[PDB]
Design a protein around this ligand. Structure first.
Ligand SMILES: COc1cc(/C=C2\SC(=O)NC2=O)ccc1O
Length: 328
């Protein structure tokens, strides 16, 4: 069978926490007063929720309300428990309340409002300095939730809300997040296609916090190289081929061989043979103001096939890429 794997950091946080902390199926939701919140406008709709801008009429402050579409009580309690566990942590979105919506007959999560800048505006105008600054802010959030026993599993640009006017960042949509338990096998059907780690694409279930670091690397590559998304696969199989055309097929085989993993035979016809590329291949006159030796080395150290070889969030914050970022 496949060789087992454990996280190289924060391996035992949940074992030494009280069972109440991670046993989310036993969580008892504390309900607020639904009439405190008046919906103002629909902002979006996923497959698991509808999101609204609203006003809290007890302080006339803006909030955002996420009305969960009927999903199983464990997935609802999982998101709720994780948000409560992480509340107040650096750059974690704040769950302000939970109310029972009378129309949907499901829970509606009430978040602090973030006056976020247009995402396309953000992609187009962030500077070299901005990218380093906000990457550091994301790493604060990821080191926090990893240190708290939780992996996000859906790191992508649309879940990183940025109020550029106040240089404020919040990591949102914990609905795919999970507690990390050593030896646990997890569903590989997480994350958006372009941000899925090699472990998901080869069906390796015993993964950990390091999945988020691959996703973060995919974001970094899209920003410094001006190609969004960077690995642009047409499906989950082509997604791994896109990665292998950059990282090379020989290290892909080293990865699956280390964990005694077998590729889906459907790759026999599509994978090919590819050398590993040097990152300078993706530099050109329209992105070179965002590229530095420090940026390329940092990216190189996030985007490893072997989840065990990637920088941890804490290690990443030590990287020379961030030396120029003003610390508070
Ligand atoms: C879309 O504007 C916001 C969204 C959120 C949080 C969300 S939205 C979703 O689907 N899951 C979350 O945690 C919080 C503040 C906002 O201003």
């Amino acid at each position: 069978g496949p060789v087992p794997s454990r996280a190289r950091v924060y391996t035992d946080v949940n074992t030494h926490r009280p069972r109440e902390y991670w046993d989310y199926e036993s969580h008892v939701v504390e309900w607020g007063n639904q009439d405190d919140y008046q919906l103002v406008r629909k902002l979006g709709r996923g497959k698991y929720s509808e999101v609204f801008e609203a006003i809290n009429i007890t302080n006339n402050e803006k909030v955002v309300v996420k009305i969960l579409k009927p999903v199983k009580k464990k997935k609802i309690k999982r998101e709720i428990k994780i948000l409560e566990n992480l509340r107040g942590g650096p750059n974690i979105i704040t769950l302000a309340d939970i109310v029972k919506d009378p129309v949907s007959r499901t829970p509606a999560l009430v978040f602090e409002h973030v006056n976020n800048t247009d995402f396309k505006q953000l992609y187009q105008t962030l500077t070299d300095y901005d990218i380093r600054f906000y990457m550091y802010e994301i790493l604060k959030a990821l080191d926090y939730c990893h240190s708290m026993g939780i992996m996000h599993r859906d790191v992508k640009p649309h879940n990183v809300m940025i109020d550029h006017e106040h240089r404020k960042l919040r990591l949102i949509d914990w609905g795919l997040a999970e507690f990390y338990h050593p030896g646990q096998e997890y569903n590989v059907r997480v994350a958006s296609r372009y941000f899925k780690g090699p472990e998901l694409l080869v069906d390796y279930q015993m993964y950990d916090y390091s999945l988020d670091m691959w996703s973060l690397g995919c974001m970094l590559a899209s920003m410094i190289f001006r190609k969004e998304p960077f690995f642009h696969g047409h499906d989950n199989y082509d997604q791994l081929v896109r990665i292998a055309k950059v990282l090379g097929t020989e290290d892909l085989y080293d990865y699956i061989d280390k964990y005694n993993i077998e590729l889906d035979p459907r790759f026999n016809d599509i994978l090919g043979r590819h050398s590993r590329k040097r990152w300078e291949r993706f530099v050109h006159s329209e992105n070179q103001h965002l590229v530095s030796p420090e940026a390329l080395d940092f990216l190189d150290k996030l985007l490893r096939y072997d989840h065990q070889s990637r920088l941890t969030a804490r290690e990443a914050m030590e990287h020379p890429y961030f030396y120029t970022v003003v610390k508070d």
